[PDB]
């Protein structure tokens, strides 16, 4: 390998990297400007509005670290993104999607199940009930994707086996 | 090995594209060091200037990764 050729090979992708990285930085700064642990949905919503899955991934890798910050209303925003991530061809996106989905299931599936099972009874409560119905619809759709991937590991464990078991009630 | 330098730039960039900024910075700082060490084994002045230009471009990318990490770290939980 000659110096000129090596330099040429390296430099080819520089402008691409500069554009992608400066755009991601700007977008993350936008998300950060509305950040508050008191309501993390606001930043998640901004990320979804920017419409760049890479920014969603970076934000989920953060909020996946503290489940106590998640509220039921956030689920109906995140689940559609989880659905995209579980179909990504990038292993690391699938893993972020799996981590978020396990978080939702472990934190919210009993509550969703209880609310939907309750005897019929308040605008706030009725909004919450419709949120729960939407979560269930979204989880039911995701469960089919999960079932189609739970056997990929064979005899071995995998994040998709875990999710399939966590979704057994659906 | 120039081929090794090319390969490490590629890995740094792939990891950055994928949001694995920790690993990206290992490869970015490693290859900046590799290039600098190689640069000064070069005796032709203009060839050294050309490698320094490349080094500066890689440094720009690495600084962008560092800025992204600083922003992400600023999300306190």
């Amino acid at each position: 390998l000659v110096d000129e050729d090596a330099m040429s090979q390296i430099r080819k992708g520089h402008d691409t990297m500069f554009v992608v990285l400066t755009s991601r930085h700007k977008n993350l700064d936008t998300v950060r400007a509305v950040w508050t642990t008191g309501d993390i949905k606001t930043s998640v919503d901004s990320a979804v509005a920017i419409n760049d899955l890479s920014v969603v991934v970076d934000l989920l890798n953060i909020v996946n670290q503290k489940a106590s910050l998640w509220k039921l209303d956030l689920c109906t925003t995140v689940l559609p993104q989880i659905e995209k991530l579980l179909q990504s061809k990038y292993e690391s996106y699938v893993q972020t999607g799996c981590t978020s989905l396990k978080l939702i299931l472990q934190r919210f599936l009993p509550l969703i199940t209880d609310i939907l099972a309750a005897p019929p009874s308040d605008i706030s409560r009725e909004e919450r009930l419709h949120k729960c119905r939407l979560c269930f619809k979204q989880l039911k759709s995701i469960s089919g994707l999960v079932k189609s991937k739970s056997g990929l590991s064979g005899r071995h464990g995998s994040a998709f086996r875990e999710l399939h078991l966590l979704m057994a009630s659906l | 090995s120039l081929q090794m330098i090319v390969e490490n730039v590629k890995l740094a960039r792939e990891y950055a594209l994928l949001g694995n900024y920790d690993s990206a910075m290992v490869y970015y700082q490693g290859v900046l060091d590799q290039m600098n060490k190689y640069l000064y084994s070069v005796k032709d002045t203009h060839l050294r200037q050309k490698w320094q230009q490349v080094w500066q471009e890689i440094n720009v990318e690495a600084k962008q990764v560092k800025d992204i990490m600083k922003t992400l770290e600023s999300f306190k939980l």
């Binding site: 080819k12 992708g13 691409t16 990297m17 992608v20 890479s54 | 590629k10 960039r13 792939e14 594209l17």
Partner: peptide, 10 residues
């Protein structure tokens, strides 16, 4: 990121 990845891959 796919386009950028293919650029970097080439």
């Amino acid at each position: 990121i796919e386009e950028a990845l293919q650029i970097i891959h080439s």
